[PDB]
Amino acid sequence: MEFAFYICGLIAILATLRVITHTNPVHALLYLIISLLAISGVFFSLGAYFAGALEIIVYAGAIMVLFVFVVMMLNLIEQERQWLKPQVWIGPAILSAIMLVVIVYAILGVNDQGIDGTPISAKAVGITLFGPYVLAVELASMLLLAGLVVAFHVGREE
Amino acid sequence: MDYTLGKLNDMVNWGRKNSIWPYNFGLSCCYVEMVASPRQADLMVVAGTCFTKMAPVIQRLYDQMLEPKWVISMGACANSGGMYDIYSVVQGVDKFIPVDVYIPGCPPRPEAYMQALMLLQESIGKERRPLSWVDQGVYRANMQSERERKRGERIAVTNLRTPDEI
Amino acid sequence: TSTEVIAHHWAFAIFLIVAIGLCCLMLVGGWFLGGRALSAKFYLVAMFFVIFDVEALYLFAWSTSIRESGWVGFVEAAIFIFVLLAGLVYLVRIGALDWTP
Amino acid sequence: SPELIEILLTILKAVVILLVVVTCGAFMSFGERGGSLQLVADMIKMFFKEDWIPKFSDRVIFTLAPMIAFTSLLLAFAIVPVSPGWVVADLNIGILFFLMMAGLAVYAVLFAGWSSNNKYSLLGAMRASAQTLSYEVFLGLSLMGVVAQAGSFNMTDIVNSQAHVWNVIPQFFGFITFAIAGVAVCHRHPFDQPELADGYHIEYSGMKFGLFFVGEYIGIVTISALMVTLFFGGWQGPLLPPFIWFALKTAFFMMMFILIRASLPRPRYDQVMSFGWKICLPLTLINLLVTAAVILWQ
Amino acid sequence: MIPLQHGLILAAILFVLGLTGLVIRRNLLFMLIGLEIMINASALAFVVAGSYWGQTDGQVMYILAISLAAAEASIGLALLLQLHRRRQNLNIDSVSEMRG
Ligand SMILES: CCCCCCCCCCCCCCCCCC(=O)OC[C@H](COP(=O)(O)OCCN)OC(=O)CCCCCCCCCCCCCCCCC
Ligand SMILES: CCCCCCCCCCCCCCCCCC(=O)OC[C@H](COP(=O)(O)OCCN)OC(=O)CCCCCCCCCCCCCCCCC
Ligand code: SF4
């Protein structure tokens, strides 16, 4: 379980690094799908089986399909490759590195008994979701309705 | 026999002859008698009169076809121009594309097309082609002609039925 | 960790790698051997698929624990599905799910 | 050691199942078309044909699309139990894994249409992708009826829950919706070609085209087997061995897919989307609600 | 057997990668892509935290996070389509006239 976790984490990091630097949008979305598949593998390593199934079904299988659809209908800044020359990403890269080093300083120093990896099934997640999480479920349906209304209002052609 | 410019070679020849995906290009009144993209097709069946206006269409659709490519000409029009030795008709589809099997007739029967399919499978199975492109020369067999092979049984015919019957 | 579960893990891994290797070898043998010689309705449909897929995930989570949730959970899913059907009805009547006007 | 020969026997069972599924998909390409070697003939014809990637195209996406169209449903087969002691992966998620593979399957159509440097093929791919999303949106709930009755995502547990009454009778609406969704997600008749829009299989030739065809028929094998497992008791039978019963039911559904292709006509594109969403999604939500009320009452 | 610290660090790495991809790109599409990366990293961190304690709450927060991600991706791609259909240009620095 540690083996799959570490290879999938490394694949996700590498794929994200190719995502944020690539020039072709379809290639970047393909690397993003690869990173999502790796993150699902990480979820399956931890025992969150429902989370991994949802990472493939919902994130890679719906959201990235929407991004892919938008890129295809765009038929697509690319030529100069601004983000490749160091005079553009000199600042943001070290800024993100400083933020990352402060965050991982906070990570190092906490109680860590390790993750057992015992599978938390989707049935227990359903009992929790439809037990002590009634208002999260109803208002999450409410939120998705809001997003649907907004995206139809903005994205229709006329 | 003569060739004009090994077990698995027999295997690919057998597979190519035993699964042919045709692209019937019906120009004219041969098309009704004989009744897939050219990128997915390997046999071009040219049936009909080869007009001067539609000759670039035939040439383009032959060029879009992928190797290996075989051509079967149906009828006198596709063979030689037929009865239309006229200003607007190309005298035979072999003026601009190579033809593997010719069929006479105007129109030929569908069973004549099936017999030409047998001839094409025989010519495919009796040929040697470059297996992998990593000699890149196509070797086509100089087959014995059908009229000399069937000469004895044709000449041996003596009596036929009178034309006063149906 | 029983012997059966690690046997099934090995079988699943072998199934994965044999399927992927068979497809890749199939395409490799295809390439190596031979002789060389839009309207906004698409975005709306994909978007509706995404939203209703997330609602479907909530229904997935409910469905596997019906006997452990009782009638209260049925009521919870009842308002959930009622809001889902109200949104679907809204999309149908406003012409959002109408490919031909 | 018994453990090593046990894991090797399980691996051999998985490989045997995989080879049988691949050969069944190819053999039913022939069956949809005595001539047992005809399949081998087209197989080596496409094998030895030269391959043509378009010059101004994208090579990686073009090569990647048939791999998705093959491996998605080929991997989705792995949850199906054939007989007692003959499963590949007895997953806790099961039908969730089938939903994962069915979700990943749309990228084959999208990738083929974009990589084929052709506006007509691209438009056809977007049309087919919109269609398969419109039916994937209720595929999962059409299976949630059976999941709700069984109370688990496992497949062996579903088959054991079918030990007295097959789920074709109580989940007949789930039966119907999963049948339509399985046919539509496989892009076959009457959902075969929705296409200024041409096919997205143009510019594909040779072994890639063979990958697309064999992937479609492998998906047919997987959909029919999961159909049998979910709605027709799986391997349960009174007299014949469970392997035999599973085989006859799977063949029964596979020739009924062939018969539906040979008989039913093609509805229109907007008609297909309107039917899919407007009928099958509220019908499936109502089916799951009524199913929950019935099981909670009992 | 897996440390919580390593999963949290992996989520932080993906979060800061999404943030710098959000900053450095003039195209709005890559900005939306970086936003998706950041929210997926946050959801991953919640899954790691929930799986460490043996609780269902991490996957529940993951479900809420991906619901948010789906809705935001929908809205952002609608706005990107509007920008492309009204300006024929996805340069985000051209959308800058309000200032002062
Ligand atoms: C080989 C070197 C690298 C080569 C290049 C990369 C190839 C892909 C590598 C990542 C995927 C495979 C990782 C290795 C998995 C091998 C099996 C394994 O380790 O299983 C352990 C565990 C079994 O489950 P459990 O019951 O918890 O057992 C623990 C102890 N009994 O398993 C689990 O708990 C979960 C198992 C993993 C989750 C399922 C598979 C996820 C696949 C993600 C693919 C991501 C995209 C890859 C793209 C490649 C190209 C860039
Ligand atoms: C083009 C290539 C793209 C990448 C392809 C994949 C790359 C990696 C290939 C090698 C994988 C080796 C096998 C990995 C381990 C398999 C077993 C496993 O995951 O076991 C862990 C878990 C067990 O759980 P369970 O048995 O239910 O419960 C008892 C717990 N002991 O079971 C689970 O968690 C099961 C759920 C996870 C199963 C994942 C299977 C692969 C999914 C990715 C398919 C990608 C398809 C191609 C790309 C699509 C388009 C982008
Ligand atoms: S050969 Fe005769 S039948 Fe055929 S196209 Fe010419 S005129 Fe018509």
CATH number at residue B131: 3.40.50.12280
Dist. CA B35–CA A4, nearest whole Å: 59
Which architecture does CATH list for C11-100? Up-down Bundle (1.20)
Write the DSSP string, B96-123.
Answer: TS--SEEE--SSPPHHHHHHHHHHHHHH
Number of domains in chain A: 1
Cα–Cα distance measured from residue A66 to residue A110, given in angstroms and rounded to the nearest whole number: 39
| A120, closest residue in chain D (CA to CA) | D92
Sheet containing B22-26, strands listed edge to edge, beginning at the edge strand earlier in sequence: B22-26, B43-47, B70-74, B101-103
**Residue E2: strand pairing partners:** A115
Comparing alpha-carbon positions, the chain B residue that sits nearest to C36 is B133
Coil, helix or strand at residue B61: helix
d(CA E59, CA A120): 9
The alpha carbons of chain D give a radius of gyration, in whole angstroms, of 20
Model resolution, angstroms: 2.7
Of the CA atoms within 13 Å of residue D27, those in its CB half-sphere come to 12
Q: Residue B68: is the preceding peptide bond cis (ω within 30°)?
A: yes
In whole angstroms, what is the distance from residue D195 CA to residue D268 CA?
A: 10
First to last CA, chain E: 55
- D11 Cα to the center of ligand 2, angstroms: 16
Among candidates D112, B64, A63, B36, which has minimal Cα distance to E66? A63
CA distance D155 to D86: 12
- Report d(CA D158, CA B155) in Å as an integer: 76
Q: Give the best residue of D4, D11, D144 to mutate against chain C (max C CB count within 10 A).
A: D11
Ranges of beta strands (E only) in chain C are none
Is residue D177 within 8 A of residue D283, CB to CB? The reply is yes
Domain ranges of chain C: 11-100
Strand duo B22-26 + B3-4: pairing: unpaired
Contact yes or no for A96 and E16 at CB 8 A: yes
Q: Are B55 and B48 in contact (CB under 8 A)?
A: no
| Preceding omega of D190 cis (within 30 degrees of 0) | yes
* Ligand 3 atom 5 nearest Cα: B48
Q: Which ligand 3 atom is at minimum distance from the Cα of B79?
A: 1
Spatial distance between the Cα atoms of A14 and A20, rounded to a whole number of angstroms: 10
Q: What is d(CA B165, CA A147) in angstroms, rounded to the nearest whole number?
A: 83
Could you give the dihedral angle defined by the CA atoms of residues E89, E91, E94 and E95, in that order, rounded to the nearest 10 degrees? 90
Q: Is D287 helix (H, G, I), strand (E, B) or coil?
A: helix
Provide the domain limits for residue A54.
Answer: 1-155
Residue pair C6/C14 in contact (Cβ under 8 Å)? The answer is no
Instruction: For an interface test with C, give the residue of E1, E59, E61, E67 to mutate (most C CBs within 10 A).
Output: E67
Of A27, A57, A119, the CB nearest to D103: A57
Annotate chain A with DSSP letters as a single string. -HHHHHHHHHHHHHHHHHHHH-S-HHHHHHHHHHHHHHHHHHHHHHT-HHHHHHIIIIIIIIIHHHHHHHHHHHT--TTT-GGGSHHHHHHHHHHHHHHHHHHHHHHTTS----B------HHHHHHHHTTTTHHHHHHHHHHHHHHHHHHHHHH---
Dihedral sign (CA D75, D79, D81, D87): positive
CA distances C56 to A149, D92, D96, D141, Å, are 18, 19, 12, 7
Closest partner residue to E74 (CB to CB) among C40, C51, C58 is: C51
Measured CA distances, B67 to A66, B122, B130, D205 (Å):
39, 18, 11, 11
Residue B118 forms part of a structural domain? yes
Q: Which amino acid is at A44?
A: F
Please, is A26 exposed, middle or buried when counting C-beta atoms within 10 Å of its C-beta (0-12, 13-18, 19+)?
buried
Cβ of B106 closer than 6 Å to ligand 3, yes or no, is: yes
Which residue's entry shows tokens 């120093």?
Answer: A109
Q: What distance in Å separates the CA atoms of residue E36 and residue A33, rounded to the nearest whole number?
A: 11
Query: Which helix (DSSP H) or strand (DSSP E) does residue C78 occupy?
Result: helix C70-93
> What CA–CA distance (Å, rounded) separates A97 from A103?
10
E near C: at least 3 beta-carbon pairs less than 8 Å apart: yes
Pairing of strands B140-141, B3-4: antiparallel
Which tokens is A119 given? 């599978």
**Considering only CB atoms, which residues of chain B are within 8 Å of chain C?**
66-68, 129-134, 136, 138
- Pocket test of ligand 3: the residue of B24, B72, B77 to mutate, having most ligand atoms within 8 Å of its CB, is B77
CB of D285 within 8 A of CB of D141?
Answer: yes
Asked if residue B7 is part of any domain, the answer here is yes
| DSSP label at residue B74 | E
Please tell me chain B's helix, strand, coil percentages from 3-state DSSP, rounded to the nearest 5.
35, 15, 50
Distance (angstroms) between ligand 1 centre and the Cα of A45 equals 8
**Structure token pair of residue A60:** 């890679």
Q: For chain B, what is the radius of gyration of the CA atoms?
A: 18
Question: Among all residues of chain C, which has the CA nearest to that of D75?
Answer: C16
Residue with tokens 């929407």: A66
d(CA C12, CA B96): 57
Find the CATH number of the domain harbouring A71: 1.20.120.1200
Pocket test for ligand 2, best of A11, A49, A116 (most atoms within 8 A of CB): A49
Q: Which residues does a 6 A CB cutoff place in the pocket of ligand 2?
A: A 33, 37, 44, 49, 119; C 5, 9, 12-13, 16-17, 20; D 67-68, 71, 75, 91-93, 97, 104, 107
Whether C contacts D, i.e. 3 or more CB pairs less than 8 A apart, is yes
* Separation between Cα atoms, residue C44 and residue A142, nearest integer Å: 19
Q: Which of A11, A9, A6, A1 is nearest to A45 (CA)?
A: A1
Interface mutation vs chain B, best among C28, C31, C32, C36, most B CBs within 10 Å:
C36
Looking at chain D, which runs of residues are DSSP E strands?
Answer: none
Q: Which residues contact E30 (CB under 8 A, 6 or more apart)?
A: A20, A25, A28, E21, E22
All domains in chain E, ordered by first residue? 4-87 (1.10.287.3510)
Between vectors from CA C25 to CA C20 and to CA C27, what angle results, nearest 5°?
100
> In which residue are the tokens 């040697």 written?
B128
Please give the helix or strand (H or E) that residue B22 lies within, else none. strand B22-26
Domain count for chain B: 1
| Residue B105 contacts residue B34 (beta carbons within 8 Å) | no
